[PDB]
Write a protein that binds this ligand. Structure first.
Ligand SMILES: Cc1ncc(COP(=O)(O)O)c(CNc2co[nH]c2=O)c1O
Ligand SMILES: Cc1ncc(COP(=O)(O)O)c(CNc2co[nH]c2=O)c1O
Lengths: 413, 413
């Protein structure tokens, strides 16, 4: 099994105090921390072999090109795509989903067509579709949720019709922890003549992804949530769909011939990568994938199952706390204390060294569905332990007691 | 003055050999090398204060947010913009120019309108306009060049008309070294009712930029050419134009309210930054700007003037070599040897440790204007010396002699 002491030794940032208390970082659904292997990969790139790529002209240029395209093959293997032509490097999940909405949706929707999403989506997998349907005169529809914040395949079958052209859905929700039944939803979409676009930002860092098992048409993910550098992501798309989509950005590197008025494009995947690419960040994401693969995604998923079952049990020990979403879940808990605003919960916890996030988590329609204005969220990854969950629940108990005390004191004035 | 020995000590990558010879890196117009101050800024971020930004919830989150928005203010001051609302972080110059073509051009062009560019443009400042004019039924026109590869203001006045809505032009050409008269061209555009979009990728690393003197409406630049990390750039636009342009990408972070079907946007600049941003890379670009400012952009420009006047003189000592572009120029020389393909020149030079680039330099219409299929380019920056120019011209002389020798030997068979 994975040894959590040995894993934590690899993350320099965990070893410090905040406000006089050891840091307890429980905000990896907002962004993850990085191991030495990734930070030293960036250092070795800038100290030894930085150059621009795809010249084949000089020695450092060749080294940088081999590093960048090597990282593309690491991503391909990591999500079990069939080809490097299906792996496009982007700035992040949000840009990957925008590319699909601009190049696929805006080119393939007409009045009467539908895009189907769900109430639990993150804004990155809502607003691009709102705009693409507005641009095309198509219709946006929402799959409803069950009362525990899961999706039933009967509701999917009801909402998706033979006029649906695109179903877009998260693999795992960054608020509910729900793992959605994507392989079954891809069957339903395809049976109705639609493609499925999967927002993989919260699944890819935490569980194995196999796009040939899922059969998703597009899948998007972000490096900064999976121990890799900021500023980089991937869009996977089945090669036959990418071949027919036009580029979302235009420039150098993605062309073959440029005349005064007309140009032709390079083959995939470079068609979709305009400009000097994100060279160091993509090589660092390759290092993150080597790091996670050496531990094992199934080992990390098993650890997070342990931490989430422990947290849900310990949260049920607290009076006056509501947890949103299903019992079977990814490694996060979003909650509120009955009489304390979640921002004040996050502030008090940060004074005890503990980092969580409060707000809408970029899911305003979901907060409205939950009937709340904001929530607090503790989210876990491979470097967190049950002792840190103990600290969190002990701090929530003291938070409850503190706010009730100030209430009672103020009661006289 | 700047001491080049002390400056070179700050760039670890320069201190190595390639093919048994000290590296001589003369390819900074393709990408620049980074000083310790920038690489250690990225290390300190990932080792100490990485977190997602714009929560205001927990201590590391606040540190990362202060670093990211602090770097925005460093960029503002660095190009003398009036406000941080005018500084948008992007993935690079190519994406910045694409944002203008998508959000400004596609929204403001109609049949009969013109976009005016020049024959010397890089593809990143050609293809987006080709696509925007195609999408809108507008017209693309080209300002012609003088025979030394400069632009005359009379040709600008002739080509720009009262139907012109956008003039897009490079500040400095990455092939000719020409510095274009942007402040005068911005007057001409504005006199005709157009905006001017300036491609600053090759000017910003090498000379002071003052967008209030230039009066450009939009200005785009790339971190990786100015000692900063890969994957980041900036788009500057005058605040009154950005206020009226819609976003180019949609998602979390750039919204204020999201309903099921409609959303509203945040104020500038965050309106144009969808998704988790390029946090480490933007903080590293802030470090690059602090590094360059401590040396002085005018000092770096004076050094490069020295190196370019030295190189042009030493190239004129070589028989059988053609240099393209004007005598008064930025710090690069693009050339060809009369009877040797530029790819073979670059290969031979790399065997002597010397890195240059051969090909079309993402300027195919310019190569056609020059009547060549490809060229070789040696480009300079603050860490290069006249001794490295001596090495280059000595290697070109030996290249000439080598290819003539193989020619003569093969002459019998
Ligand atoms: C499910 C999901 N979709 C899309 C995104 C957008 O990814 P980005 O482009 O890398 O920002 C995120 C990141 N969500 C969060 C980022 O900070 N707290 C979060 O919950 C997400 O978790
Ligand atoms: C004048 C100019 N415009 C735009 C670009 C595109 O900038 P990017 O988006 O950062 O790639 C470059 C980079 N030009 C070169 C990149 O490699 N050799 C070059 O000459 C350029 O020099």
């Amino acid at each position: 099994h994975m040894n959590i002491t040995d894993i934590r030794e690899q993350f320099p940032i965990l070893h410090q105090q905040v406000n006089g208390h050891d840091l307890v970082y429980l905000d990896s659904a907002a962004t993850s921390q990085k191991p030495r292997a990734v930070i030293e990969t960036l250092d070795k790139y800038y100290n030894q072999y930085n150059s621009n790529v795809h010249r084949g002209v000089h020695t450092l240029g060749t080294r940088a090109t081999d590093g960048y395209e090597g990282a593309r093959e690491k991503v391909r293997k990591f999500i079990n795509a069939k080809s490097m032509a299906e792996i496009i490097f982007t700035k992040g999940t949000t840009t990957s989903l925008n590319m699909v909405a601009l190049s696929y949706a805006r080119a393939n929707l007409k009045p009467g067509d539908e895009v189907v999403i769900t109430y639990m989506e993150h804004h990155a997998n809502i607003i691009p579709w709102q705009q693409a349907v507005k641009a095309t005169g198509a219709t946006l529809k929402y799959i409803p949720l069950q009362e525990d914040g899961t999706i039933s395949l009967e509701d999917v079958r009801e909402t998706v019709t033979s006029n649906t052209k695109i179903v877009a859905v998260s693999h795992v929700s960054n608020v509910l922890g729900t793992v959605n039944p994507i392989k079954e939803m891809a069957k339903i979409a395809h049976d109705n003549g639609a493609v499925i676009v999967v927002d993989g930002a919260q699944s890819t860092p935490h569980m194995k992804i196999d796009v040939q098992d899922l059969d998703c048409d597009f899948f998007a993910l972000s490096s900064h949530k999976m121990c890799g550098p900021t500023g980089v992501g991937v869009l996977y798309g089945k090669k036959a769909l990418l071949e027919n989509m036009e580029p979302a950005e235009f420039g150098g590197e993605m062309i073959d011939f440029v005349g005064l008025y007309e140009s032709t494009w390079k083959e995939l995947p470079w068609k979709f990568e305009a400009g000097t690419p994100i060279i160091a960040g993509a090589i660092g994401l390759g290092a993150a994938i080597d790091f996670l693969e050496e531990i094992g995604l199934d080992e990390i998923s098993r650890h997070e199952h342990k931490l989430a079952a422990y947290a849900l049990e310990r949260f049920r020990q607290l009076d006056g706390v509501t947890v949103y979403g299903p019992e079977e879940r990814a490694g996060l808990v979003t909650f509120n204390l009955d009489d304390v605003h979640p921002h004040d919960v996050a502030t008090v916890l940060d004074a005890e060294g503990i980092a969580v996030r409060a707000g809408h988590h970029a899911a305003q329609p979901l907060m409205k569905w939950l009937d709340v204005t904001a929530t607090a969220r503790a989210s876990f990854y491979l470097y967190n332990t049950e002792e840190e969950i103990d600290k969190l629940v002990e701090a929530l108990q003291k938070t409850k007691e503190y706010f009730t005390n100030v209430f009672v004191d103020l009661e006289h004035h």
